[PDB]
Amino acid sequence: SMFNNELMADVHFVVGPPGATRTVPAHKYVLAVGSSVFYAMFYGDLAEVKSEIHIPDVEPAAFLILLKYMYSDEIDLEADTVLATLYAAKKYIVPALAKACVNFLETSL
Amino acid sequence: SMFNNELMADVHFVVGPPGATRTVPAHKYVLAVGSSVFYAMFYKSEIHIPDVEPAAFLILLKYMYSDEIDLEADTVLATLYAAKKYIVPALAKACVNFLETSL
Amino acid sequence: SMFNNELMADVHFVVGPPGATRTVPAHKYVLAVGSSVFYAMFYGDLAEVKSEIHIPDVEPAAFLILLKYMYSDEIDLEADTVLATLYAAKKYIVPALAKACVNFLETSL
Amino acid sequence: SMFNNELMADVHFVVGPPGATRTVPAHKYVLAVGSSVFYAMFYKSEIHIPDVEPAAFLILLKYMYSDEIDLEADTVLATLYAAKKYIVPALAKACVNFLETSL
Ligand SMILES: [K+]
Ligand SMILES: [K+]
């Protein structure tokens, strides 16, 4: 799979709070197709070329769940990370994922 | 008006990331009655909660003193985190309801 | 001055690359009035309440020049930081500052 | 077509932040003729430039091999940084001109 694969990766995200980051390879095409926010960042008028992008306010597990959905259409939520995933989904304007997080929060212990 | 009041306050919370905190006075009785986590804690007088947003903590406390829930789009996720952290189910339910409505 | 003053500060920016950051207090009102990007971040539909905001891709000196302009209308460029200031000005959509950086680059050694 | 070509390459640059680099072959002669900084350097065969964007470095090199300048909005600032770093004034001028036009 291209998800979380260094093969052809044209961007790396350094995700998480300082001292507890994870570096995630990604593909600008898949991200921009899936999100108006990644589109703006990579293809929009104010896009700036950046090999490495920091996302200090997102949890790594959450970011990987978001990207899994953007590559595969699969939603792989877990109780421990669903709230952080909802933050990421709202942040990048991925509403199908946002909705699934809300339903998950409604129906989980 | 005991909410956020230094009068009779027996606990202070230092809330938020170091360098961007807010100190909030509170009353152990009121918190412990609304929360099993605060009960376990109180039953030190300065408590640091660097993982919680001050704005969310204040919304949680207002609920615990007044039973009033006042949510907004910019604070609901952080309030939900706090409500789950302190096990305040009525406030957590209200946040999830707000979120559903906002979809 | 309210510029870079902890008095009434309702946000703190942790500016710069990891290990070389500076924490800058600021006031959401002044920033949102001066920039559609800070407006979006603080007052817009997808605004999320955040005490501390990280800006890993901006230089601290540059960010302080940007904010000085937003508080005071004064532009205080220097050769050593003008390029990083132009990046910040483009990034937050402050065109009067962008223009001054370009003119400065044109007319400096 | 010696630009970005491993054929005869006597230097390799590891360009960009560690973990997000690109390795670019080059020819010391061509670089040294276009730049006082590269002249001083060459007159080791693997050079790390973690402060430069790969895309910008490639635009700089294309200029140095071909005299062609191909700028875009998303790469112009990073190209200007590189052009100033290696003291390539014609490319720096072109970037500032592009920026002026874009205002
Ligand atoms: K699944
Ligand atoms: K001045």
UniProtKB/Swiss-Prot annotation, chains A, C:
Stretches assigned to coiled coil: none
Keywords: Cytoplasm, Signal
Expressed in which tissues: Expressed in lens.
Signal in keyword set: yes
Subcellular location: Cytoplasm
Gene Ontology, cellular component aspect: cytosol
Main location: cytoplasm
Positions of the BTB domain: 9-79
GO BP term, example: neurogenesis
General function of this protein: Adapter protein for the cul3 E3 ubiquitin-protein ligase complex. Involved in late neuronal development and muscle formation.
Protein's recorded name: BTB/POZ domain-containing protein 6
Gene that encodes the chain: BTBD6
Included range, full protein: 129 to 236 of 538
